[PDB]
Symmetry: C3
Subunit: 89 residues, 3 copies
């Protein structure tokens, strides 16, 4: 009875966490496409100056997309919630 | 006794998760305002070329703000922690 | 027996959540460095116009980096998982 309740409490919290993680990654994917397009525009505008980084006289900053990691963790979390929901039923 | 302990363990973890989710969304909100201002500047600098996208000769990337989703999930999580803390007291 | 199982269920979920939080913050750190470099390039390109914000005729958008907050919450979560794993063994 207490195992049933706590398992349901954990699943309800984790469902909300998994939805938030997906949404945070979705916004990062959305924002990064705008940022990378902005960089491409800056590289063309400063082409004669060797692009953005040479124009500023700095080391280049590159974006490291790690979306597949968060996608995989969310899939594992959702599998665990589903396995626990089935154990109950 | 074990139900009391596990309920407290879950609430402590979830409080920390909810704080992190809020903070990740806050940083995304903060970063997106800088990115959108950067895009507006690029659109003005390339106005004669039809703006950023026509200047690059690409399909436009737009940002999809989904802050309200994460805000809502965090509010539900915090309500669930509070309901459980009250059940204990 | 039920306390052992639920404690293991919570640790498995939270390990995955903590990994996702770190990864979301890592991508935000990575993206912000590209965005801030983009802003520096725009400030130099619009120097005669007083920089990006004066060029657009807008209030300046600044990025509020809160990485240390998420790093700290992840460290506390991982400490809690480890304390619980030890309580079991
Ligand atoms: Cl940008």
């Amino acid at each position: 009875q207490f195992y049933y309740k706590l398992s349901q409490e954990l699943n309800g919290d984790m469902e909300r966490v998994a939805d938030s993680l997906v949404t945070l990654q979705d916004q990062l994917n959305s924002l990064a496409a705008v940022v990378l397009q902005n960089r491409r525009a800056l590289d063309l505008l400063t082409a004669e100056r060797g692009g953005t980084c040479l124009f500023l006289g700095e080391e280049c900053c590159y974006y490291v997309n790690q979306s597949g990691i968060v996608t995989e963790k969310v899939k594992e979390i959702r599998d665990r919630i589903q396995r626990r929901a089935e154990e109950l039923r």
